[PDB]
Amino acid sequence: NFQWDKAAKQYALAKYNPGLIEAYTRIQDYEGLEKLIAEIPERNELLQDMGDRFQQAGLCDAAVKCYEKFGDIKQAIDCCVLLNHWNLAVELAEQYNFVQIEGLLVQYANQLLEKRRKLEAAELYRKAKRNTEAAKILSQIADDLTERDANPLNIKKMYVMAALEVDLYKKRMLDATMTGQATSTAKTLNSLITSTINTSSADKILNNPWRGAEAWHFFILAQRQLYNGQFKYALKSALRLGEYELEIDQKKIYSLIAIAAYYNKSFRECSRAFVKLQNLENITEDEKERYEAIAVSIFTKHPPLDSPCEYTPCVGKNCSQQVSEYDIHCRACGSNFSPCVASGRPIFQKEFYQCKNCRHKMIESEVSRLKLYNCALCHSPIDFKRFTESNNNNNNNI
Amino acid sequence: AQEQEVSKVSAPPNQPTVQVQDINELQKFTKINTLPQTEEGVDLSQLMQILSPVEDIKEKDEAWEFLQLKTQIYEIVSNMYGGNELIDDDDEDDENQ
Amino acid sequence: MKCSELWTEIIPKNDPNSNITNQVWSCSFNNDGSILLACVGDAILVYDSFTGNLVNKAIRGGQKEQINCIKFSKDGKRFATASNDKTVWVWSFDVNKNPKLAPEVKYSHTDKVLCLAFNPLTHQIFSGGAQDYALWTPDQQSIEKSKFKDKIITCAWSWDGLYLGFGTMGGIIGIRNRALEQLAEIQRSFPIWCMDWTPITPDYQNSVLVVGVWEQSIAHYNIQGQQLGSDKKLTYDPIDINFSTQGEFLLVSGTNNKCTLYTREGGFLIDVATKNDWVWNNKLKPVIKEAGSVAVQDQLHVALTTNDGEISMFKIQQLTVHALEGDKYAYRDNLTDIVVQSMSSNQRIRLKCKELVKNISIYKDKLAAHLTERILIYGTSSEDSQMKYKLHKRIVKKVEAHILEIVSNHLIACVKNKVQLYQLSGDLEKEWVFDSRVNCIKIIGGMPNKEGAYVGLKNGQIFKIFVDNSFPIPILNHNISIKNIDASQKRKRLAVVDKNSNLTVYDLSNKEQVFQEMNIVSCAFNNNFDDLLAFSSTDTTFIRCSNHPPLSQKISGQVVGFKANKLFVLNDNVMSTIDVSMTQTMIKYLERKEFQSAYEISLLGVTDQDFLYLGNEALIATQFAIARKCYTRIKKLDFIYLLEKAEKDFKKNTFVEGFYQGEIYALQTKFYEAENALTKSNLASQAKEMWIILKEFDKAMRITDTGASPIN
């Protein structure tokens, strides 16, 4: 009589699975179908039936679950590929030893690339642990950006966007993993924590996807500070750019370093930058010529004089040899200093805190002076005093 | 009456006024610190070919949202690649509609 | 929505070194609309509204100077011609008489005449020029002239026939009565050009003066002279103002050489035409409505007169936008209105809005209205049979899209070659970019935040979109462009229509062109049987089943929806429901012995006679379950008794179908064919014992004379 809800409730009361299935399909209430697949004992043709229904409905998670319960795995891979559910496809292929998925994703990414959808290809590579190719694509996008007006804030936006997408994908995967774990998973997580205590700088550097974002932000901050006086902060920022030298090419970094060093009268850094600039990889004869002409004029007007400053005691190690304020290299000790995104000054004090989105060390005095309500890099909109208290608690835990 | 007030209170700048603060900086900055370079026999005009105008570079603490940054970046890469408008012109929508 | 030019007449007789020019100042329009008038330097032109030609030759020499204004008398019987010769003539008019137009009464002021106006009720003339204003009454034939301090520019009489309004280039606007006394005076700082009176309306029943000042503003004034405070601003200086009949629209012209349309509140709707010169006078065609007449009245007609000497005619046609999901039909009424109609009780529900609606989409117990830069959503109380609409949420964000749809907790907008997904809050969520323009989209059911949809492009490729996938799934490819698509109830087949009115049916399991049809306007799938297709051409609607010849109806209209034993036909903008008989399909299914599908078809609300028929064949062909269902659907006792007798006797005895066929036949009043059936194979004795019970023994003896008793 085309009254599906009453028929469904009668079938549920009478323990009739097929009629319940058609009734739930007609009412389009697949929650009852999820309850059914949880209730259907094992290995029936009805499993294939609800798997096909789920695949038609577009919920390939339930379709794959039904196919795996049925005993067929290739149909689950077919559903995952047809609906472009690539995370589940990669997990199933890794668990079931499927080898064609990598190549298939390769030509699908190539097809997207030929359709001029590089960001979609980057998203696809993010979905399948291929972040290196996505990073290369984003670097190419930034290089294309430099060819035009090239507002650096847009490049900062795109790099922070890539980092946040990677962090989001990782956190969904982790939240899926921890929920409902066993003793073996607990032991694996304990070993992971033990390795996390004794980490290495290189591994953390590779893991962090904020390299381009922080590099571009430091470039923008250096330029902005240099325009509005504050030369000494500009030198520290330019030194940070020279400490990255990965996304930004040598020319811009050394140009900014030379400008800042000339404006602050610190001529050792200016001489180093000018020696760097004479031959990066290739240069025309006339450009090189005007470069040494500028160098000779600058260094023949008056000899390079080192501007005295304060040699604050080192906090990285127990050595009594003080290190210059601008220097972050920390020679003969190997203890490099973490940056401060707020102003660029190296962390030389106990007061340092970070948020749980970008984990960059913040100096309390700089934030108080600038009255920054948000994180300088990722713009996290939560009260900073509470972050300071939380970091103090975390340090007390350590 | 309430609509206008609430919109003005929130006013999320979507496209039109994201960073529209364009004022000549090639001549404004040469007032700030260029004179010391000029009285002396120093030529660094090549070396300032790297810096960009700062009046375009907007400096103020705002709120960054995941989705609206995503939309801005997609719209930027789209008009960079310039593929939407060419196929729109090849679509001859005005001829049909 | 669409604006189409009708006929243009140009007057190029420019005369240098002469004060007579080729400009046109005013265009008087008749109440009926069968005739039109225009004024040119030293001439008056008469035109037909429908076709552009001079019914009468241009009159020259009557007035030795230019003609400033021409107006009818709201009855199509008089003209008033004011000239710079300091004189005003009034002419009598009638189409049937041999002299169509002839001067009747001429009078003269002291200076040049600038404006004229008529009385809707008493047909009195008010003519105002420099230094003077005069009133003429037909009965007395005595004019009343009065002096004033500066030249009046425009005049307008109220629709009640009581009040009069005039304006001066010095900024003074005066409102007087029929006795010409200073009822109200308002002083401004800018010249006054255009005024009008709002038409009387049963909803409003109050008349106000609408005056367009030259400081880029439009003002509403009451009778006492107190402003209503609107003071709506404009980008361009207005020149002419005209109200449509019943006070629904407002035609505004002036600077920027554009003729625009507005609502009476002030909402912009469309721009009629851009001539590339100042439009001196634009007029609307009044309409006459019969007592209880039914008509969409979408057509609108405008007449424009420009500075260079072009008198052009434009026609405005309003498109139809509507939505139909289930048990409801929400269609756009006269602009800025939404009417929801139910097909059962024919009851209507009206929603009134001020701005123009662009798209109407209705989901489950939810309706979405797309106002200009505004979005409204209304829910429904399901428990009550009558619906109650309450505004749950409102969206202020401005969105432009030719197609808008609402799904559970999401909105979809199609703009150019892009599809945008909007949250109910307003912020954009996801984007999809396609090669060509997205022509038609169809939404299919599913879970919240997981509703799929179908998309057709101008190229023709049919794609599928999921909300969270963010990756289009190529369904199929079509060479011609796509106009409308439909999905089967089970999602087994898909019907697609091209630009040539060609219908093609594609199977989803195997991509093949199973069915092709020519000259198809619309099509629809059934929502209960999954197999019936009802497609309507321009004049004839055909219903087709699986491997069955089409059914013709010659019904006037287009098919929009198909439900169980129901087809929806829409004519113009009204809708109707028509029932269909399933007897033909039932018979054809009985022909090939697929009793299951025949019973499924008969379950769609068929008459009890077909039910007993199908039960009879089900019992005959040894199908007891379907026979029991058919004999149970209609209250029958003897047939079901014979049924359990047959099912009990089937397992043991030979189960000869002749006896049961004869018993079925004899259960009705027709007996002779049952006798013949029992006589056919061999059942004479059982026929005799069967026919004895009803006590007419003579014919039983007639039967037993031939029948034998092979026992011993």
Ligand SMILES: [Zn+2]
């Ligand atoms: Zn040290």
Ligand SMILES: [Zn+2]
């Ligand atoms: Zn941060």
